[PDB]
């Protein structure tokens, strides 16, 4: 059933209709409503932070076509800048499973890739989206194929002013009189300010297949972003002449070569990424002069190469090896230096009997000039019962994460002599699948994980290490699909995660009420539920997300000005498809914030009420 | 399956000679808050501004000035200075339309100077019409690294220091509203105070290695009032970040953190060796001295992301009290 590579591995797979369901969704929205991951984002087209299994953002690695995507200076990825329509395949490697491909993925790994199409001749697609607040979305697809070549081109453009009206509960405007006294105070109905944005993404793919076992590929991805940083809720006055801007130009390229044979296979790969960052903070004073108060520029160049192998001694024994190299040449204007990163791994997969299965992974790393202890990993898989496919899993590892480039080389606070975090993990879980005779398909899993973080890197008046953290909990997910009638289909996907994140560090000072406390901005509970109903050409989709209370203080103390209520959101989409002569029409209307909540997900960050969105999709048909 | 957030007011009736604590809060969180402490009954009220007004204070509260029964709370990251009553904590007004103000200084009942960071101008406001009535241009000051922090007046002049990315203190003539003379000190003079015998005390930060001006030994100065000169300079050795050299009620005794809380007298000589409070593995962020009895309050910020604690010590040095306030207690003011 399962492939030899997937032995004793806990992961979740995003299928095509989840990713290709809407052109306005970034990967932050995909992970929010389709997985138990916590995503910290105060709206649309804004910084999104992923906390995976009770860890920080720096503990989650992102790879696009095998090349790591995390910003080397910050160590974290902004998931809001990755359109879902630019991703054809996504996987989520949980905990120990991240060791199978990456290094310091203490939380986990997010594996993104682009898949070759199967198009004969020429074809194209155009989708246009119109919604509230004067938002506009466009997406254009061009492709061609002739059984050896596969050329594709995509473009995504998104723009909006972000001037939604919200009722402000954190500020009171006062009505004066002839002698400057407050007579009445009312909660104003303001609009989001300094929130406009314009994004451009272009993706180009060229694929070649000799048909003799050699496959070549080339992907190029260009990003042009122009976003403004919104004002806080507690910001006073009609403050015009104040602009924030974060321009961001970036190019990702990967070259791939695959050489396959009877039982063995070798894959070579190389890439290059260039990034240019620009932050502005200006004020218009006087009459026409616009003085500048903050100006930051940064340029990052990275070269990537990788070589993988795989050998089959038989159908019940397997060997893999691989070497990876990254070189982050950073020339940040306003320190200019970088790191060389090497990783190698050798793995043995063995299937001694039909039920039992074992796997052993050995990985070594060397970042710049400092080696790391060998990272081992053992995965074991056993089949408790063939009837209901009840299966048991277990794993264990000792993972290490290197400090980011700012933790090492930075202008105000640049400690070079910094240790690397370590984490000891062990997991166990069960799974099942009760597929019946085309009536329903129910499958799910439940896994327990216990993980210890040591030498966590934190800045406090500057890396100071410390911060021992204990992360554990239970993950549950289940899928269901039943055909009520010959024309009605229902699908339910639900996930749940109880993820305490307790810090066990020695009490700093004497009044530290933080030992044994939940970490800030990490919910203890999370749940998602997605329902899809299909009737001929009609389709109704329901998305629901639940986050428990998120604490803004390490002491978890009750405060009036720092309280975040549990987050519950509901989105509904209705889609209708028509079949014309020279084209196919797909109409869908999206309703976000169905119940019109006046809420606050991130402290002092206003968020819109009920808003709408309407899409038109045209796919020409030819001979 | 729904979410909500409102607010409700509360009738505070604070009396006695209390102490106001301005909790800065974190940065781009909007959790700055104000606290009140009563030294007689040892009772502390947190979040007095929000509780009595049903609205948040703002972001990064910096300082506060009490004139008669009206206190002016300046909020840095919200471009606002709130005017509240010191007996009910009700809002009496606001000054809005500033560019990250630092401090306010009233030179007359109809005029007041406000100093900003990231600006080369010193605002002039009317504390009654609530409007800006002009600006003061600091020479050789650029918008990129503009900074002026604290005001002390001496007769017809006003003295300021230029902290962030600056090494200069300026003298302003209030009659003509112009900068008349300049003085040069070490890198980043943090705070400026005046004593009973008319000698300004300023203390210079180190630099926090990496800064464009580079690092320099933190120092202490005793600039004279009438004529600038430099009179005397003190050396504090590298690896330290001293600041907040405010005086006592009588204005004849110095107090600065510099790791071990020091206590120096005016018209004296080189720094003593015995600290007022040697060290008890605490992270002291700010302090104040009571003008009534002489008790010394020191603020502990712990880890900058939780409720801080203030310790109350007598003039001798014995602990009397300790209590919790908002996040990062930054400054103190006496009702
Ligand atoms: C100690 C500290 C603090 N800082 Co500095 C001071 N003194 N800071 C530092 C020191 C070390 C930290 C560092 N290397 O950045 C010090 C002096 C080097 C530093 C730097 C600066 N700081 C500055 C200022 C004045 C401020 N700083 C505070 C944030 C003032 C803080 C007070 C406060 N109210 O928050 C503060 C007391 C505690 C921050 C903290 O660690 N929080 C705990 C942690 C959870 O927070 P965090 O968000 O993860 O921390 C990061 C940021 O706060 C950042 N940061 C600090 N200052 C800034 C300014 C900007 C524009 C940005 C984008 C980030 C920062 O530092 C951390 C590392 O990235 C400030 C609110 C204090 C105040 N009331 O004056 C104020 C912001 C004022 C304003 N309206 O802009 C400087 C201009 C001073 C200077 N010239 O050295 C400078 C700006 C940096 C630059 N790019 O030029």
Author numbering:
A (entry chain A): 48 to 381, 406 to 532, 539 to 700
B (entry chain B): 21 to 355
Task: Provide the authors' original text about this structure.
However, BtuB3G3 incubated with excess CNCbl in the mild detergent Lauryl Maltose Neopentyl Glycol (LMNG) eluted as a single peak and had a pink colour after SEC, suggesting the presence of bound CNCbl. We determined the structure of this complex by cryo-EM. Data analysis produced maps of sufficient quality to build two slightly different models, named state 1 and state 2. Both states show density for a CNCbl molecule bound to BtuG3. In state 2, while density for the tip of EL8 is absent, the visible part at the base (green) occupies an intermediate position between that in the BtuB2G2 apo structure (yellow) and state 1 in BtuB3G3-CNCbl (wheat). Moreover, state 2 density for CNCbl shows a different conformation for the vitamin. These observations suggest that, after ligand capture by BtuG3, EL8 in the closed complex is poised to move inwards and destabilises the vitamin in its BtuG3 binding pocket, perhaps acting like a spring-loaded hinge.
